[PDB]
């Protein structure tokens, strides 16, 4: 038979596998209802806590290339799902573990991938079979989906309060009809240090982190809002300009007239009847004048400078009020109106602007985060953000699956026989391929501290007639109907996870060498 001369590739392969397995096993601890968040201190000196693996990995300063792709892999999963970033990598590494298994089993890697290509085709087929179609309007199942995602991170503390906040927010921003893929950036997150995670808030309106510029105007009722872009200061041209002084009456005439210019400026604004002012950054040139504020405050008008050009669409998306860049255009026709708006006072003096109630309901919405630990607030929103993501993922496909590993054991079981069906060495690959999925339930019982092998096999043994509804329970610490435990995840989640892993490891196999570069 043919003789293999070189082993540099094979060993190089093994190196990657050992790395990957080490990586996944390191992450293995954090997953599921018994997931355990981790912490990193930056070399720059920053400190982070995290339960989501992706953020762990984006924190990971990995030296070895392979997992860097795995790190990259999750980001797509994060850019896809949000959790299972947890789950997906442990799937990825587990594949390579068995992929290692086949390596000293001498099978050429190429056939493995196609076998895996076949292996995935069965699974994606199977997963379609087992999923549960669900229309979007059923709030509770969304809620059921929600906490299922949520009881994976610390935010489980106020999960019961947090989950409704999430879903309601989605309902308010979505169209429950087109079943499209509505963006999340239309949802605003507010990291406000202090408070209680319980005191994290939803705002059906607008909130700006910035602070007022008026000393005296604090709360406004029936506010008529105005957002203005053109600066309110000494008129300065884009091109070079200068007033020349050579005569007597130039002084006051200049002096008086700037205020007059400013005066009419404000005069028109008041003439419009607006009462709350929004001012963007004009860092290229002059901003709002101090003098105008004197007038506007004399005109008793709410005012805010320094509005980010990036937020402006969101805000007019939020407030439904087109901005103004020229006086003539500034007209009450465009003047937005709000039922009430003002600056709240928290943090003792961490004061924040609130705008509740809008005659034009924008689809967008903002979200308030309160809580003691600064890091915990950031991790909370991560959990909140992914909570949104999975819902949007669920918005993508109106089909539902129980969480808690039951799909996986079904799959491997289903793979177990189909592997038996298929002849050739491919069967072993699929035999191994299914054995890869075996890890996740084992991980659960690990993080459940329960006898994994006894449980998961019994989980298989039950599941031989204990189909996807049933599985290992966390709360009771046994194996039960997970559907009856209301622990359910959208189909695509594992789909994306399963799919994404499959392509990558195929790419993993094709590797033969790494060459150090300049």
């Amino acid at each position: 038979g043919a003789y293999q001369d070189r082993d540099k590739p094979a060993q190089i392969r093994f190196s990657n596998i050992s790395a990957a397995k080490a990586v996944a096993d390191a992450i293995r601890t954090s997953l599921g209802p018994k997931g355990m968040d981790k912490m990193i201190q930056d070399g720059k000196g920053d400190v982070t806590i995290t339960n989501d693996g992706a953020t762990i990995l984006k924190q990971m300063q990995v030296l070895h290339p392979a997992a860097r792709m795995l790190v990259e892999l999750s980001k797509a999963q994060d850019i896809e799902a949000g959790d299972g970033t947890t789950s997906v990598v442990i799937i990825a590494g587990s594949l390579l573990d068995s992929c290692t298994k086949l390596l000293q089993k001498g099978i050429h890697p190429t056939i493995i991938s196609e076998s895996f290509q076949k292996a995935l085709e069965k699974g994606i087929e199977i997963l379609t079979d087992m999923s549960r179609p669900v229309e979007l309007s059923d709030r509770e199942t969304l809620l059921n989906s929600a906490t299922t995602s949520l009881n994976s991170k610390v935010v489980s503390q106020y999960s019961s309060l947090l989950s409704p906040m999430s879903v309601n927010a989605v309902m308010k921003v979505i169209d429950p009809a087109t079943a499209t893929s509505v963006d999340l950036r239309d949802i605003k997150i507010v990291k406000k240090l202090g408070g209680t995670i319980d005191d994290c808030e939803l705002v059906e309106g607008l909130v700006l982190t910035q602070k007022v510029s008026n000393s005296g105007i604090t709360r406004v009722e029936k506010a008529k809002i105005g957002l203005i872009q053109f600066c309110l200061s000494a008129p300065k041209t884009d091109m070079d300009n200068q007033i020349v002084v050579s005569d007597y009456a130039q002084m006051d005439r200049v002096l008086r007239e700037e205020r007059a210019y400013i005066l009419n400026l404000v005069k028109q604004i008041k003439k419009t009847g607006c009462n709350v002012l929004l001012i963007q950054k004009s860092i290229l040139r002059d901003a709002l004048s101090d003098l105008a504020l004197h007038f506007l405050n004399k005109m008793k008008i709410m005012v805010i400078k320094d509005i980010e050009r990036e937020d402006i669409e969101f805000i007019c998306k939020t407030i439904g009020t087109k901005p103004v860049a020229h006086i003539d255009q500034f007209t009450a026709d465009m003047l937005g109106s709000a039922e009430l708006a003002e600056e709240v006072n928290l943090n003792g003096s961490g004061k924040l602007l609130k705008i509740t109630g809008c005659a034009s309901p924008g689809k967008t919405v903002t979200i308030v985060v309160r809580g003691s630990n600064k890091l915990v607030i950031e991790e909370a929103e991560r959990s909140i953000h992914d909570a949104l993501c999975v819902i949007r993922c669920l918005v993508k496909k109106r089909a539902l699956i129980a969480g808690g590993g039951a799909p996986e054991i079904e799959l491997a079981l289903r793979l177990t026989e189909y592997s038996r069906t298929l002849s050739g060495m491919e069967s072993y690959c699929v035999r191994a391929f299914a054995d890869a999925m075996e890890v996740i339930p084992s991980t659960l019982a690990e993080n459940a501290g329960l006898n994994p092998i006894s449980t998961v096999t019994e989980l298989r043994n039950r599941h031989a007639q204990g189909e996807k509804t049933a599985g290992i329970n966390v709360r009771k610490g046994g194996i039960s109907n997970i559907l009856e435990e209301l622990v359910v995840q959208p189909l695509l989640v594992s789909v994306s996870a399963l799919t994404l892993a499959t392509e990558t490891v195929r790419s993993i196999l094709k590797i033969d060498d790494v060459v150090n570069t300049r």
Binding site: K38, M39, G43, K44, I49, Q59, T196, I197, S372, N373
Partner: protein, 41 residues
């Protein structure tokens, strides 16, 4: 004694927010299971 009789009194919210705030932190710190350090660049 009776600090009620002694007048030794404290504002409620002091303990109130306290027990909350400690709860959160204890919630935070307990969940950790692993630290990873980075030497500076």
């Amino acid at each position: 004694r009776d600090n009620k009789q002694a007048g030794v009194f404290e504002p409620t919210i002091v303990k109130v927010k306290s027990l909350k705030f400690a709860t959160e932190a204890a919630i935070t710190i307990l969940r950790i299971d692993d630290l990873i350090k980075l030497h500076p660049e």
